[PDB]
Amino acid sequence: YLNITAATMEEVYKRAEYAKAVGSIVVMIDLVMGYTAIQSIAYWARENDMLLHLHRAGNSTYARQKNHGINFRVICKWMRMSGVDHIHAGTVVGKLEGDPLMIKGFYDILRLTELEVNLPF
Amino acid sequence: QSVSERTRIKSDRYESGVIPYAKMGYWDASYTVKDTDVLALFRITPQPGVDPVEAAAAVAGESSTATWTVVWTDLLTACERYRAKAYRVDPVPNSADVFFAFIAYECDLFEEASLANLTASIIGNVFGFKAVSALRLEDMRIPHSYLXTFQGPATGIIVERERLNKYGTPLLGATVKPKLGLSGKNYGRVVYEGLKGGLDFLKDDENINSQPFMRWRERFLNCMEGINRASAATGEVKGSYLNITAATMEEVYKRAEYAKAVGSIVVMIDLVMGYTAIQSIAYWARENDMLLHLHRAGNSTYARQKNHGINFRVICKWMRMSGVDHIHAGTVVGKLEGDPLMIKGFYDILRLTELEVNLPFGIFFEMDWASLRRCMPVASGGIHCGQMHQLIHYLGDDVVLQFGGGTIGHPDGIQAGATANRVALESMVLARNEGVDYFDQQVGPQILRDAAKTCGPLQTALDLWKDISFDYTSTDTADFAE
Amino acid sequence: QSVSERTRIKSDRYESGVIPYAKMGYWDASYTVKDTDVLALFRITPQPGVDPVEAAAAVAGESSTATWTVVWTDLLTACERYRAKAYRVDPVPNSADVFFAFIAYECDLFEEASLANLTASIIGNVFGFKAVSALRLEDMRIPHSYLXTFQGPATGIIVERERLNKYGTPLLGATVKPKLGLSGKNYGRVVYEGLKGGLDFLKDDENINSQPFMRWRERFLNCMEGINRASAATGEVKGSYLNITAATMEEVYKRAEYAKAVGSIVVMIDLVMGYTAIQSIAYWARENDMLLHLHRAGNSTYARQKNHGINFRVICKWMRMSGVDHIHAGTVVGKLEGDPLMIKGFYDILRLTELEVNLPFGIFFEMDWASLRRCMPVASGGIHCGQMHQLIHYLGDDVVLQFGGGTIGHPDGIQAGATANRVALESMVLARNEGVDYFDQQVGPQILRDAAKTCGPLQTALDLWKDISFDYTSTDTADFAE
Amino acid sequence: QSVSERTRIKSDRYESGVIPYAKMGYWDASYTVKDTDVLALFRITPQPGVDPVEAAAAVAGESSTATWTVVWTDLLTACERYRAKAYRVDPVPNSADVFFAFIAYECDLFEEASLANLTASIIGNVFGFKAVSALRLEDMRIPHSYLXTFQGPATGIIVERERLNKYGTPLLGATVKPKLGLSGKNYGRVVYEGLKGGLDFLKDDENINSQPFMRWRERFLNCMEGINRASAATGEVKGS
Amino acid sequence: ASIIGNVFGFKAVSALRLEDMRIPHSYLXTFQGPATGIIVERERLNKYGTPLLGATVKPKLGLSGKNYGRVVYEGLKGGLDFLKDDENINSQPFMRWRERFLNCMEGINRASAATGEVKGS
Amino acid sequence: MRLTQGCFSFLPDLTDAQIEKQVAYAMAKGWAMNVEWTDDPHPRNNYWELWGLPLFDIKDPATVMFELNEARKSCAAGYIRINAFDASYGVESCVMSFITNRPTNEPGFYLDRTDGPGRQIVYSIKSYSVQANPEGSRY
Ligand SMILES: O=C(O)[C@@](O)(COP(=O)(O)O)[C@H](O)[C@H](O)COP(=O)(O)O
Ligand SMILES: O=C(O)[C@@](O)(COP(=O)(O)O)[C@H](O)[C@H](O)COP(=O)(O)O
Ligand SMILES: [Mg+2]
Ligand SMILES: [Mg+2]
Ligand SMILES: [Mg+2]
Ligand SMILES: [Mg+2]
C-alpha cells in the first residue's frame, strides 16, 4: 500500500499518478486527509484501476467514548459511500479498542448488501 | 393614413393571409431535378378531404422555407431558389388514399457534414402535421456533392477485412449472454471461449454499458486478456465490440480512448446515443484506427410500420454517411422483423458503390455513393447454424453473422457453440463455390449434416435447433412483390 | 463419455433448447412492485396465435436478460434478481387483440445518469420482434432513486422566470421566418423588431444551423445587437434561442461557448442531435448559466401513431430527466397534432412535482419527480392571437406561446405582430384573474375585440386570422374519453 | 526456368518497357466529361518533333497515375478509373506550334478540401518535363462536388459590406509608404490621418511584417489607437 | 515578400528573372538550416561511401495502403534504402493516410529485419 | 496447433481437387490469383513472400495449380496460401484467401505479458518457431 497522503490534493494526485505509472495494484490514504480529498481520490481509484486502502488515522479522537462523538459504524457507512476499498475496522484480540459485538457490527456494515436491526451488534 | 398601411404588400402572393402551400411555390410537376438536389420520397396519407397534391406541397413547404401564413420576409431572400418543390405524386398500389410524394430540396439548404441539419429539415416537424394522418420517409437521394462533405465509414469493409486478414467467407460473431448480470471477469471468460472456439468477434450486449454488477473498465481489461489469449491460441486477429455507449460525449470518449489504449481492434455504440454523438465518435474512429460497430437500438420504434415513420433503408444511408463501420441490418430468418427483399435492399445500400432503381428491394432512387466506403451489414438475432444455407443465400459474403444464443446455448460449452458455427459457415461456402445448389431445402441441410460427421459440435447443434423457425407475418413489406 | 456430455446441465430450466419466455422467469402476476423498480407500460399487438402473456413475457425478457434459447451463463449471475417481470396484462378498450403490458425492471439494470442506457434496455430491440405486429411504449415510472442520479432541468421554470423577471402571464415568443434563406443581418432585424414590439423571445428555426446563406457567427452577433437594442428600448430582459445544433459535439460546444461569450441568456438544440449530445449540453447549460430550449425535431416519426412507437409523454419524462429547460409539447388548436387531454397530460409531466394516475390524460403510473426541476412547455405551430382564450384555457400559466407566422405575417410589420400577441395575452389573463368565463365561445373573442379598440394591431390580427382553424381527425388519441 | 520469368506479364499494355502515354489510356478524344471531374486547360508548347496529342497525354499521365515505363502495380488498382484523360487538343490562334489541351481528372484523385493536393497533381511535375519546352495552366473547372468540401471566403463581399456598413460605392484604401523604415508610432499616425481624411482602410505593405525599425506589436497597438480615433472622428467603421 | 513580391508584374519591365542571391552570413545565422543534414543523415542510416538509393511507389495514385506497404517492403528488401509516397499521395478515397503509414511501417521493419540495414519510406 | 488464418482452416486440409474448384470459382468471378509463402505464422504478418507475380491474364485453373505445385517444389517448409484479388472499383482488395499447405507440426504461440500502468497489460504474441530459428529453417 503506497501511501499517497499529502498536504495538498495537488500532491496526492502526483503520488497517485506516479504509483499508477509504476504499476502498483494499490495505494493507501489516511483519514486525516479528510472527506473531500477522500471522495476525490476514490473517484480517482475507480478511474485508474487502483485499489484504495483507507487508514483510519484520527478516528479514535471522536470514536472511542460511549458518551460523546461519532460511533465508528457511521464512519464505515460514510467511507463505504465515498468509495474506499479497504478500511481498518478492528481486531478484537489486538492492541486497539474492540469489543466483539461492535466489531461485527462494523464488519457487517462494510460487507453486507443489506442490514437488519440487530441491537447487540 | 399611417406608414404601415401605405407600405402593406398588396400582391397576390405577399398580401397577408393564408394561401394553400401549392400556390406558395412548393408544387411543380414540370420541375427538372438537378444532380445537386436532395430528394425525398414520402409515403403520405392525407386526412379525408385534403387534396393529395396540397399534402405534398405542405410537407415540401414545411420541410424547407414555408410556414402556415404568408411572410413578407421571404422577399429579403432569394425565395424562389430556397423553396422545396414537390414534383411527383403517385398512388400506392392497393391504396385509394395513400400516396408517394417526391420532393426536391436545394443543396444549399443543408449544413455541410451534418446529419442533424439534414434531418431537422427532412424529419423535423412534418410528421406531426394535422393535415396528414400518416407519413413515412421511404427513400432519399443524397447527391454526390453533399456526400463529399461527409467522411463515410471510418474503416469500411475493404480495410476492415485487411485489418482482420480474413477474406472469402462471412465474418462471425456472437452477443454475450445473459444480456445483463455478468461480472467483468466472467465477460472475459465468455469472450475467450467464443473466440478460441472459432468466432472472429463477440460483443457486449447493447444494454451493457457500466452498471452495479459490472463497471466498464473491468470488462475492457478482462476482455483484452480474453482476446489476446484467443489470438495467441489460434494465430488469428480477434476482437470483441467493447460498448462505449455512455450518458455524455465526455464519458463515451473516455471509454473509447481506454479501448484504444488497451489495443481493442473494435468498439461499439448504440444508435440511442443519437446522430451528433455518432458523427463525433465516427470521426474519432477514423482518427484512432478503430472499427466502429453500430448497434441499431431503438430503430424499430420509427421503422417497423408500413404507414408511418422512417424506413430503415434511409437510416442505412444516414449511418453510412456519418461513418459507422458495421450496422445491424437484419437476418430474414431470425427472431427480428426482416422481409427478404427489403433486407437485400438495405444490404445493397450499405455495400454498393452506386444504386439503381429497384422497386422490389425498396430502392426508389438511383444514387451514386461518391466513393464513400462500404458499411458492413451485421445479421444478428435468433439465428442458428442450422440456417446457414439461407443466410449465405440472402446475405452474401460481406456480412457479420452473429450467434448469441446459437453459440452460448450449445450444451457442450461455448467453444463447441463457436466451432459448430464456423464449420457450418465454412463447409457451406466451400460448397457454394463448388457450384452446388445449396439454397435447396434438400441440399443445404445435407451439406451441414455431411460436415457434421467429422464435427460432433455441429451434429449436436443441428439436432438441438432443427425445429426452430420464426415464421410470422412481416409488417415492413414491399409495395411491389417478387 | 467426454467431459462436455458428462457436465451438461439436465435441469428443466437449464437443459439446452428453446422454452417460452413465460417459463423463463419473465412472468409473475403475483409480483409486488418495489419503490425502486423501473416500470414500463407497453401497448402490445401480438401476431395471430401468439399468447398475449407470452408476448409480454418476451418483451420483458428481451428488454432485460433473456435471449431466444436457454443459456447456462445465467447461473454465473444472480439471474432471479436481474430478470424483468411482466406483472399485469389488460386488454385495450375496443380491441380484442391489443393489450397493455406492465413490466418491472430492477434498478440495478441501469447505468446511473444515463438516458442512453435506459433506452437501450427499454427500446433497444423489442420493437423489431417478429412475435409482435405492433408495440407502443406508453408510460414509464422512473423511480425516485434513479431520478436522483440525473440533473433534471439545467435552469427550470422557477429560475427561468427569475432570470427573465417575468411572472403572472405566459411567456411569449416567435420562430423567425422564412425557415431558411435569411442572412445573419436580416435575422437580427427580425429579432430586434419582434422583441421591441413585445415578444420575450424569438428563435432560430430548427433547421437554421450554419449554411451558405447564413453562417452561425453572423447570426449570433447580429442577434445580440438586436437583443440588447430591444432590451434597452423596453427595460426588459430579452433573448433569442440561438440554435447551436451541429454535426459534432465539438461544434455544438463551440457554438454554445460563443453564445455564452456574447451574453445570450438562452440557446436551442434540436432533438435529432440525440440523447447523448442532449445530456452533455444539459450539463453544460447548468454549468454555464444558460437556458436550454429543446426543439423536438423528428419526435413525431415514432410518436404520432396509436399502434406503434413511443408516446410523447415518455419523451417528456426522459427530456426533463436529461435536463432541458423548454420542450415543445403542443398547441391543441394549432397546425400540429395535439389532442387536448393528451397535451394536458404532457404539460403535467413537465410541470408537476409528482403525478397521480389520471387515465384520461394518459398518466398510467403514479410518479414522484424527486425535486427535479420543472420543464417549461412550449406551444408553437400555427397559432394566432385570435385563439388566446383557448391557449390560456388548455395550457395554463407556465408555458411559452410562440407565434411565428402569427407575428411576422402581420401586414403592418413585425412590431405590430408582436404587440398584437402581447395585448391579446395580457388582456386575456387580466380577465381570467377577474373571474370572467373566458373560454366561452361568446366571451373570449369579445375580450380580444374589447382590448382591440385601443390596439389597432390586434384588431388587424383578429380580422386577418378570424377564419383560421386546423380541425382535423387527431391520430394520437386517448383510450379513455373526457 | 524461374517463377519470375513464367509469371512475367505478356499483354500489350502491361509488358515491361516504354510505350507512348497516348497508348497507356491518357488520350481519349471521345471521353464524356462527368460534372464531378476536375478539368484543366493547358497551353502546351511541345518540343520540336514531339506530337501534340502525345504531349497532352504525357501531361495527363504524369499528373495522374503514369510514369515513363509500364508497371504491373497498375493491375492492383482500378487503373482505368484513376487515369486522367486528355480529351481535347486544339490549335491555338496565330500559332502552329502551341496547343490547348483539356484534361479530365476523376474526383477521387484529390484529397477533400486540400489545395496542396490538387496543386501537387495539377502542377507538381509536368512543367519541368523535357518533352515539352513550355507549359501554362490557363484555367480549371473545379466541379461543384469538390467546391462543397472547401470553405470559400471566410467573410465574403456581402458580409464584409455588412460589417463595414458601406454599400453603393467601391471601398477605398491605401498602402502606407515608404514601404519600409517607419516605426509603429508613425505607422499609426499615417493610419489615423488617411482614415480621418476619408479612407475605409489603410494597409501594411506586403514586406512590412516585423523588423528592427518596427516590431509588430508596436505597429498593431498604435494602429488600433489610429483606427478607433478615426472611427470616433467620423462615425464610421474603419480599419487597417 | 520584398524580393519577389510585386516587381515581376511591373509594366515598365516585359520580363524579369531572379537569377541568384547573396544571403549574408548575418542573415543566415538567424535560420536553422537543414534539420538533420547530409552528415547526420548518413550517420542515422549507417551508410557511407556510395550515393543513397530510392524509388517512388507507382502507380502514382490508386493503390490501397495495404498494397503500398507491399511495394515498400519489396523494394526495400531488394536493396533500396528508401521508397517514397508520390507527391500527390496524401489522403484520398482509395487510400487514407493512417492506413498507408501503418502498412508501410510493417513493410519497412520487415525489410530491415531481413537485411540488417536501417530502412525507410 | 492448427493455424486458423485463411477461410477454410476449420475444414480439413484441402485436396488438390478441392483447391482447383475454389480457384475455378475465383477465376469465373473474374478475379486474379496469386500464391504466397511464409514461415512466420504471426497474426499480424501481413506480407507473406510473393511466389512471382499474380496471375492476371490467366484463363485456365490448371495454370494456377501448376504454379502452386512449383511453389511447393521450391519453397521451404512452412505455409503457402492462395489469394484472389478483385481490382474492381470499391473493392481493390483481396476477396478470398485460404491455406493450401501447412507444416506437419505447428507449435503455435505464447502470450507475452508486460506490465503497463495500473492494471493494463502490454501484450505480445510470440511464435515458438520464429524465436528458435531464422527464415527458411523454422519447421
Ligand atoms: O439483443 C439481442 O437479442 C441480440 O444480442 C441478439 O442475440 P441472440 O444472438 O442471442 O439472438 C441483438 O442485440 C439483436 O439481434 C439486435 O437486433 P438487430 O440485429 O435486428 O438490430
Ligand atoms: O417550424 C415550424 O413550423 C415552427 O417554427 C412554428 O412556426 P409557426 O409559428 O410559423 O407555425 C415550429 O418549429 C413548430 O411549431 C414545431 O412544432 P412543435 O411545436 O409541435 O414541435
Ligand atoms: Mg443484444
Ligand atoms: Mg420551426
Ligand atoms: Mg505593397
Ligand atoms: Mg512523384
Mark out the alpha helices in C212-248 (DSSP H runs): 216-234
Instruction: Find the length of chain F.
Output: 139
Rounded Cα distance between C255 and C258, Å, is 5
Using only C-alpha atoms, chain D has a radius of gyration, in whole angstroms, of 27
Q: How do strand C354-355 and strand C367-368 relate by DSSP bridges? A: antiparallel
**C185 interaction partners in chain D (CB closer than 8 Å):** 159, 162
CB atoms within 10 A of CB A92: 13
Q: For residue A19, what are the contacts with CB-CB under 8 A and spacing of at least 6?
A: A2, A4, A27, A50
Is B264 close to ligand 1, i.e. is its CB under 6 Å away?
no
* Superfamily for domain range F1-139: Ribulose bisphosphate carboxylase, small subunit (3.30.190.10)
Helix B115-123 with B275-287: angle, nearest 10 deg: 160
**Ligand 2 atom having least distance to the Cα of C174:** 9
What resolution does the deposited structure have, in angstroms?
2.6
The three-class DSSP label of residue C262 is coil
Rounded Cα distance between C326 and C157, Å, is 8
Which amino acid belongs to residue B199? L
Measuring CA to CA, how many Å separate C228 from each of C180, C195, E80? 24, 10, 69
Give CATH 3.20.20.110 domain extents, chain B. Answer: 151-465
Instruction: Find the length of chain E.
Output: 121
* B335 in contact with chain C, both atoms CB, cutoff 8 A: yes
Q: Which CATH architecture fits C151-465?
A: Alpha-Beta Barrel (3.20)
Cell numbers standing for residue B325:
463501420
How far out from the chain centre does Cα C213 lie?
30
> Is residue A114 packed enough to be buried (19+ CB in 10 Å), middle (13-18) or exposed (0-12)?
exposed
Which residues, listed in sequence order, are joined to residue C354 by a DSSP beta bridge? C368
* A16 in contact with chain F, both atoms CB, cutoff 8 A: no
CA atoms within 13 A on the CB side of F106: 23
**B372 interaction partners in chain E (CB closer than 8 Å):** 93
Q: For residue B379, what are the contacts with CB-CB under 8 A and spacing of at least 6?
A: B328, B329, B330, B331, B332, B334, B391, B395, B399, B400, B401, B402
> Is residue C442 packed enough to be buried (19+ CB in 10 Å), middle (13-18) or exposed (0-12)?
exposed
Instruction: Choose among C392, C472, C480: nearest CA to C437.
Output: C392
C-alpha torsion sign, points F46, F47, F50, F55: positive
Which ligand places an atom closest to the C-alpha of E5? 5
Which amino acid belongs to residue C80? E
Instruction: Choose among D91, E31, C449, C61: nearest CA to B205.
Output: C61
The angle subtended at Cα C16 by Cα C13 and Cα C20, nearest 5°, is 55
Using only C-alpha atoms, chain F has a radius of gyration, in whole angstroms, of 17
Chains D and E touch (3+ CB pairs under 8 A): yes
> If DSSP states are collapsed to H, E and C, what string results for chain B?
CCHHHHHCCCCCCCCCCCCCHHHCCCECCCCCCCCCCEEEEEEEEECCCCCHHHHHHHHHHHCCCCCCCCCHHHHHCCHHHHCCEEEEEEECCCCCCCEEEEEEECHHHCCCCCHHHHHHHHHCCCCCECCEEEEEEEEEECCHHHHCCCCCCCCHHHHHHHHHCCCCCCEEECECCCCCCCCHHHHHHHHHHHHHCCCCEEECCCCCCCECCECHHHHHHHHHHHHHHHHHHHCCCCEEEEECCCCCHHHHHHHHHHHHHCCCCEEEEEHHHCHHHHHHHHHHHHHCCCEEEEECCCCHHHHCCCCCEECHHHHHHHHHHHCCCEEECCCCCCCECCCHHHHHHHHHHHHCCEECCEHHHCECCCEECCCCCCCEEEECCCCCHHHHHHHHHHHCCCCEEECCHHHHCCCCCHHHHHHHHHHHHHHHHHHHHCCCCCCCCCHHHHHHHHHHHCCHHHHHHHHHCCCCCCCCCCCCCCCCCC
Q: What is the DSSP letter of C92?
A: P
- Cis ω for the linkage preceding D178 (within 30 of 0): yes
Which amino acid belongs to residue E62? G
Is B328 close to ligand 1, i.e. is its CB under 6 Å away?
yes
Q: How many inter-chain contacts (B to C, CB under 8 Å) are there?
A: 426
Q: For residue D106, what are the contacts with CB-CB under 8 A and spacing of at least 6?
A: D36, D37, D38, D81, D82, D84
First to last CA, chain F: 13
Instruction: Choose among F81, C151, C214, C127: nearest CA to B302.
Output: C127
Give CATH 3.30.70.150 domain extents, chain C. Answer: 23-150
Q: What is the DSSP letter of A57?
A: T
The answer to whether the beta carbons of residues B436 and B443 sit under 8 Å apart is yes
Q: Which of F47, F50, F86, F89 to mutate to test the interface with E (most CBs of E within 10 A)?
A: F47
The answer to whether the beta carbons of residues C113 and C149 sit under 8 Å apart is yes
Is B380 close to ligand 1, i.e. is its CB under 6 Å away?
yes
Instruction: Choose among B442, B449, B476: nearest CA to B339.
Output: B476
Measuring CA to CA, how many Å separate B198 from each of B425, C8, C195, D148, F103? 11, 21, 67, 46, 21
Strands (E), D47-131: 85-91, 99-105
Q: Which of A2, A4, A18, A20 to mutate to test the interface with F (most CBs of F within 10 A)?
A: A20
Q: Pseudo-torsion of CA D40, D42, D48, D50, nearest 10°?
A: 10
* E102 in contact with chain B, both atoms CB, cutoff 8 A: yes
Rounded Cα distance between B368 and B370, Å, is 6
Helix B216-234 with B249-261: angle, nearest 10 deg: 30
Rounded Cα distance between B113 and B111, Å, is 6
- Helix (H) or strand (E) segment spanning residue D128: none
Which one is catalytic: B293, B295, B344, B389?
B295
CA atoms within 13 A on the CB side of B209: 27
Instruction: Choose among C379, C418, C422: nearest CA to C190.
Output: C418
Q: Which of E63, E64, E105 to mutate to test the interface with F (most CBs of F within 10 A)?
A: E64
Q: How do strand D99-105 and strand D38-46 relate by DSSP bridges? A: antiparallel
Instruction: For cell 506479364, name the residue.
Output: D9
Rounded Cα distance between C419 and C196, Å, is 9
Rounded Cα distance between C302 and C122, Å, is 14
* B156 in contact with chain C, both atoms CB, cutoff 8 A: no
C295 assigned to active site: yes
Q: In the CATH scheme, what is the code of domain C23-150?
A: 3.30.70.150
Q: Pseudo-torsion of CA B271, B274, B275, B277, nearest 10°?
A: -100
* D18 in contact with chain E, both atoms CB, cutoff 8 A: no
Domain boundaries, chain F: 1-139
B315 Cα: distance to centroid of ligand 4 (angstroms)? 23
- Helix (H) or strand (E) segment spanning residue A24: none
Which one is catalytic: C85, C203, C238, C295?
C295
Measuring CA to CA, how many Å separate C387 from each of B156, C331, C342, C447, D185? 54, 10, 19, 11, 66
Q: For residue B387, what are the contacts with CB-CB under 8 A and spacing of at least 6?
A: B333
CB atoms within 10 A of CB D131: 16
Residues with CB under 6 A from ligand 2: B 62, 67-68, 125, 128; C 175, 177, 205-206, 296, 328, 330, 335-336, 380-382, 402-405
Q: What is the DSSP letter of C47?
A: P
Rounded Cα distance between D166 and C121, Å, is 59
Instruction: Find the length of chain D.
Output: 240
CB atoms within 10 A of CB D137: 15
B175 Cα: distance to centroid of ligand 3 (angstroms)? 6
Chains E and C touch (3+ CB pairs under 8 A): no
- Helix (H) or strand (E) segment spanning residue C344: helix C340-351
**E102 interaction partners in chain B (CB closer than 8 Å):** 289
